[PDB]
Design a protein around this ligand. Structure first.
Ligand SMILES: Nc1ccn([C@@H]2O[C@H](COP(=O)(O)OP(=O)(O)O)[C@@H](O)[C@H]2O)c(=O)n1
Ligand SMILES: Nc1ccn([C@@H]2O[C@H](COP(=O)(O)OP(=O)(O)O)[C@@H](O)[C@H]2O)c(=O)n1
Ligand SMILES: Nc1ccn([C@@H]2O[C@H](COP(=O)(O)OP(=O)(O)O)[C@@H](O)[C@H]2O)c(=O)n1
Ligand SMILES: CC(C)=CCC/C(C)=C/COP(=O)(O)OP(=O)(O)O
Ligand SMILES: [Mn+2]
Ligand SMILES: [Mn+2]
Ligand SMILES: [Mn+2]
Ligand SMILES: [Zn+2]
Ligand SMILES: [Zn+2]
Ligand SMILES: [Zn+2]
Lengths: 158, 158, 158
C-alpha cells in the first residue's frame, strides 16, 4: 500500500449580500462571497489538496475558468467530480484535514454539517474528515474582514 | 498500520512588553504577544495539526475560550492534554513539522530548545520533531511587524 | 517502511526587472524578485518541506545567509544538495505537492516544465511531483501585487 500527501489553499473576497457557502454549508453573514462558482473556499482548498495528492494539478486545471463541460457549478459537484477522477486512477481516501481562516462568521457550529457533506461527497466515514477554524486576531486581510482563506491537506492510498 | 495526516495554522498579534513564548521557549523581544493563553502560536498550530490528524477538531473545540476545566493555562499543558486524548484514541506519533512565520525575532537559536520541549511533551525522540522559521521579506502583517503566524503538519499512526 | 511528513513556506518581494525564476522556470513578468539567491519561492518552499520531513531544519540552517560553502547560488543547486543530504540519512521520495500563491503572472503554462526540473532534481518520476497556483482574489500582499508566496508539503520513506 503506497501513500500520497496533498496540499491545497484558497482565498475569496467578501461582496454583496449574505449568506456564504463554506464546506457546502450555507452560513448567514452580512457580506457574501465574490465568486465565479459558489465561492466555497473550504471545498476548493480541499479539492486542490486531493487533486495534488493524486498529482492531477488543481481545480482550475480540471475545470477551466471558462469551459462549457463543468461550468458555473457549485463546489460540491466539482469536489465529487474530482474524487471520481482521483478514484479512476486507483486511489482511496486516507483522510482529510481542513483549516478555515476567517475573522467571522463563527464556523464551529457549522463544522459537523460540513463533515456530513464532505464525508458523503467522498463516500467515507466522518472520522476521516476534520475541519477547523481560526482567526488571525484581526490582522491581515482576513483579520480586517476583507475575505476568507482556507488550507487543506489530504492523504491518499493506492 | 494506518496513517493519518493533520494540519494546523495560528496567528497572534504583538502588544505590551516582551518577552514572547514560542514553542515553549521564552524569547526576548521589544513587543510581547496579545493572548488569552500565553499566545504561543507555534504550540497552538502544532496542537491543531495533531488534533486534526486525530479528527478531534481544534484547540478551541477541546478547550472553549471561556470554560472552567482547562482555563487560561500555558500552551504546553494544552499540548500535553490534547496528546493524552490523541493517545486515548489509540494513536502514536509519526512526526511533526512546524513553520514559524515572523519578521523578527530570530527564531533559529531557539529551535533546539523548542524541540526539547515538544519532544518531551509528546514523549518521543527529537528526530520526530522539526521546526523552521521564515520571514515574508517585510511584506504582509508579519513582514510589517504586527504579529506572528505559524503552520504545522502532523503524521499519526494507529 | 516508515513514512515522514514535511511542510515548507516561503515569500519573496517584487523589485527591479523581470523575469522571475519559479520552480526553476524563467517566467516573463514586469517586475523581478528581490533575493539573495535567485528568489525561487517554489523551490525554497519545496526544499524546506523536504528538509523538515527529514528533520534537518530549513535552508537557512543548511546554507547560512552568509557562508562561503554554498554561496549566492541558484535554488536548483540548493534543492539537489539538500536532497543529497536527505538521501544520505536513508530517505527516498514519497511525493511532493506545491502551491504557488500569486496574483500574476499566470503559472499554469509553466507547471509542466517546473515538474521536469523538480523530478530531475530529486531523481524521480514526474507522477510524484505536483504543482498548483492560486490568487488571493486581489486581497493581501500577493493580491495587491507586492510579492509571491508558496507552500509545499512532502512525504518521505525510510
Ligand atoms: N498565479 C496564478 C494563479 C492561478 N492560476 C490558475 O488559475 C486558476 C484559478 O485561480 P483563482 O485564484 O481565481 O482560483 P479560484 O478560487 O477562483 O478557483 C488556478 O486553479 C490555477 O490553475 C495560475 O495559473 N497562475
Ligand atoms: N471563524 C472562526 C474562527 C475561529 N473559530 C473557533 O474559535 C477558536 C479560537 O479562535 P482564535 O482564532 O482566537 O484561536 P486562538 O489562537 O485564540 O486559540 C478556534 O479554535 C475555533 O474553534 C470559529 O468557530 N470560527
Ligand atoms: N523569524 C525568523 C525568520 C527566519 N529565520 C531564519 O532565517 C532564514 C532565512 O530567512 P528568510 O525569510 O529571508 O528566508 P529566504 O527566503 O530569504 O531563504 C530561515 O531559513 C531561518 O533559518 C529565523 O531564524 N527567524
Ligand atoms: C498561511 C499563509 C498562506 C500565510 C501567507 C500570508 C498572507 C497570504 C498574507 C496576506 O496579506 P496581508 O493580509 O498581510 O495583507 P495586508 O496586511 O497588506 O492587508
Ligand atoms: Mn484568539
Ligand atoms: Mn530572505
Ligand atoms: Mn478566482
Ligand atoms: Zn476558490
Ligand atoms: Zn493561538
Ligand atoms: Zn526564499
Amino acid at each position: 500500500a503506497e501513500m500520497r500527501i496533498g496540499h491545497g489553499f484558497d482565498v475569496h473576497a467578501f461582496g454583496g449580500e449574505g449568506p456564504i457557502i463554506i464546506g457546502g454549508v450555507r452560513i448567514p453573514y452580512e457580506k457574501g462571497l465574490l465568486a465565479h462558482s459558489d465561492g466555497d473556499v473550504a471545498l476548493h482548498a480541499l479539492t486542490d489538496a486531493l487533486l495534488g495528492a493524486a498529482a492531477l494539478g488543481d481545480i482550475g486545471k480540471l475545470f477551466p475558468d471558462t469551459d462549457p463541460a463543468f461550468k458555473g457549478a457549485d463546489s460540491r459537484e466539482l469536489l465529487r467530480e474530482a474524487w471520481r477522477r482521483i478514484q479512476a486512477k486507483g486511489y482511496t481516501l486516507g483522510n482529510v484535514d481542513v483549516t478555515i481562516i476567517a475573522q467571522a462568521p463563527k464556523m464551529l457550529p457549522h463544522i459537523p454539517q460540513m463533515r456530513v457533506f464532505i464525508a458523503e461527497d467522498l463516500g467515507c466515514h466522518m472520522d476521516d474528515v476534520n475541519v477547523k477554524a481560526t482567526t488571525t486576531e484581526k490582522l491581515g486581510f482576513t483579520g480586517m474582514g476583507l475575505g476568507i482563506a482556507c488550507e487543506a491537506v489530504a492523504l491518499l492510498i493506492k
